[PDB]
């Protein structure tokens, strides 16, 4: 599938993708990439307040991926995530927005359907979760089963912290096993758009 990633934010967002790399997107700028069929574990995100040298090495305030402009792996929370797995059994793509790795930039992720998390989550973030330039999931900050779901299927459920996210962005994953209301499919052959600050 092709993904068009567009920055509508008034500030620069350094877009990233696993797999795909990364690009500086000033306001209004787009980057289009191809992710091949069968790819799983994939994600697109944006990074805020980056500094990079002439070789693309540096650091971002949110979503940094091992200090590279061109990501070769996942970023550091908090980062709003567009997650996808392509061309899975029965020709289904599995898509979602996740806040399980935190929020940093409001996002729209569209394909056969539009999913959005566009609220001022940073401005309303609980003091327990606040991070420079974003809002961490409780699981990232507090390493307990109640937030992280490590103890098996059904061992965790919504918490006052997951609900902070879920009340505001009902369609995104708010805790690791938030599947029934956050996991979507599109028929395979769909193409996608990720928009920052929709």
Numbering used by the authors: 25 to 222
Q: What did the article's authors report about this structure?
A:
Among the grape PR-proteins, the thaumatin-like proteins (TLPs) and chitinases can undergo changes in structural integrity, particularly under certain conditions such as when wines are exposed to elevated temperatures during storage or transportation. In this paper the crystal structure and some physico-chemical parameters relevant for the haze formation mechanism of three isoforms of TLPs isolated from grape juice were determined. Plant TLPs generally have three domains and a cleft located between domains I and II.
Despite sharing the same sequence, the two VVTL1 isoforms, I and H2 exhibited differences in their chromatographic behavior, a feature that allowed their separation and that also indicated that they possess some differences in physical properties. The physical differences between these two isoforms of the protein were also observed during crystallography. This domain comprises 11 β-strands forming a β-sandwich of two β-sheets. The two β-sheets are stabilized by four disulfide bonds (residues 33–224, 89–95, 140–213, and 146–196). Domain II consists of a long α-helix (α5) and four α-helical segments (α1 to α4), and is stabilized by four disulfide bonds (residues 146–196, 154–164, 168–177, 178–183). Importantly, disulfide bond 89–95 connects domain I to III, while disulfide bond 146–196 connects domain I to II. The comparison of the two structures performed with the algorithm for protein structure alignment and comparison named TM-align tool indicated that the two proteins have a root mean square deviation (RMSD) of 0.78 Å, with a TM-score of 0.98, indicating that the proteins belong to the same fold (thaumatin), confirming results previously obtained with CATH.
